[PDB]
């Protein structure tokens, strides 16, 4: 079972990974072996000095703050998103343009955007006086607690993955990881593509022919958008696993749908499971979100992504074509 | 003693009230007496069906979550900054509902409670708790937030428990917008906007909520950073307070081995030097442009302001 394992994460580099097989053969531990592969396939212990044990400490602890009885919102997620926003990193049009230390923000901010996920939406927590939403003001509740416990959780025994960056290497991740994370609030969405767009339209290469990146704003730009498009990555890989993501994802939107119902709410869109058409929803999620997003993603780095492309315009078919 | 706090508080709709002596006199519940005081000369009691008792009981609860040992930033302050936006809001040149009235008022009064008498950069640059649940972002006015609206859930102090459901959510964010905007890293973007403003002032005039929630901000923001245009005897006391605060953070900046941060260092401190540069630079500009807003209403504000600037001046 460990070398079926071994095998599995020889595709780490793909787009299309067997990440549900891979939590199975690790006993659910995909975050924690899809971290560690992608670790030492950048070099990135011997790089920052990180100790194996203090990594794979962290990384187990981590992955047990994801919520098991949570469909979609699971370590599951974190660890596609962490090995998507890998490929997306290693795209040709950004070779060289990334620091070892904006390559490991990027990813740690994967492997954290969503822990602690309770499996209801910002706006379900707002609108039920939550906890959560009391102690963030209503502003991006989820994403402000995901990196709080993320951050937090380096400070358990042996969990301080960072401790031989240097203090201005501590500061600088610290702020790249936070810009990441909050960037990932869906509400953000429209803004975060806007900007986007007119990053494309005014965009730079360098003689080398990669993106020119000169200044804090535009690489942190980029790389909101790259974790963003991991998030929304999922109708863009092969249509098996898109399938289980939207299954898994249907089950934790019509249980807060169940929810909403129960307290009278008015039942948040995708959530009714007794007015649901999850085909028309897949199909207006592509064409309203996913589509725009990454095609202007696959515009930034042309051509790069084109059959990351194609794959999200078959996938759009078939749903449609079940309609 | 009781009799001397009733005359102090028929002040309460002027510039300049002895906010130290109703402190004193109230044993030191100025925040509670001044809040009652303009809610009933505003009838917001009856506005929107607050039960007295519980106002007193959310008050005397927010007021005992300031901290006591803090030289300036506790429920004096509150008290001041509350009776400072009840003022400015009486402008003649202002428009506002009586909802963001009351945002107004309830942002004033919880806009720094407990506050630990040390800076956003302190707390962030000494990985606080504070600083880590609110990544570093506006992390004490996230908090005062936060604790001002879970007071309201202590027994018998939900104060809007009969606003509507929709008002409460309308007043809920406005509150948040306007305690925000009160983080001292937003001044120049929030002086920014109010200048465009008045640049665009109409009057007989603000038609969307986007511009009446800056007008809200900056006038919070205004009152917050109030003291240097009070009379001297007052600005003088806020004065010495606030440099106490600041002494024994750069004390702990010191013994840490940060950076000291402004006007921290009592070894190579001068106040006088910083009041006139904290005026010139930061109080005079904003107050400039709020005047501008509200032409001519506070004039007699800015010219305090200008005599307390000349005044420090001269003690140089
Ligand atoms: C308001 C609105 C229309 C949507 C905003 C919104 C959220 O706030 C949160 C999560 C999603 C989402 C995520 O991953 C999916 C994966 C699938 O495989 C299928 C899916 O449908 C989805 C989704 O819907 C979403 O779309
Ligand atoms: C320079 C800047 C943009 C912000 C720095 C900054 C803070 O962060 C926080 C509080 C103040 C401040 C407040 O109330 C005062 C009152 C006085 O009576 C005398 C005073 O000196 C001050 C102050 O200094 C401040 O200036
Ligand atoms: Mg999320
Ligand atoms: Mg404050
Ligand atoms: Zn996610
Ligand atoms: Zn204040």
Redesign the pocket.
Known sequence: QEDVLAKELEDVNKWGLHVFRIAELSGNRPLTVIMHTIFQERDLLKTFKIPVDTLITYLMTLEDHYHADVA?HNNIHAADVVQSTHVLLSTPALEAVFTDLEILAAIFASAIHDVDHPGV???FLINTNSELALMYNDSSVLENHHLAVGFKLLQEENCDIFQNLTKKQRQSLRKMVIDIVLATD??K?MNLLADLKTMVETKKVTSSGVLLLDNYSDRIQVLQNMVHCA??S??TKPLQL?????????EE?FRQGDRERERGMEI???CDKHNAS?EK??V??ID???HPLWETWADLVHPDAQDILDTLEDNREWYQSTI
């Open positions: 979609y939406s910002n706006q869906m509400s969405h998030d929304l999922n109708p898109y399938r289980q993501w939207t299954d898994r994802i249907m939107f948040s869109p995708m999850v929803s897949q207006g999620f309203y979100i996913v």
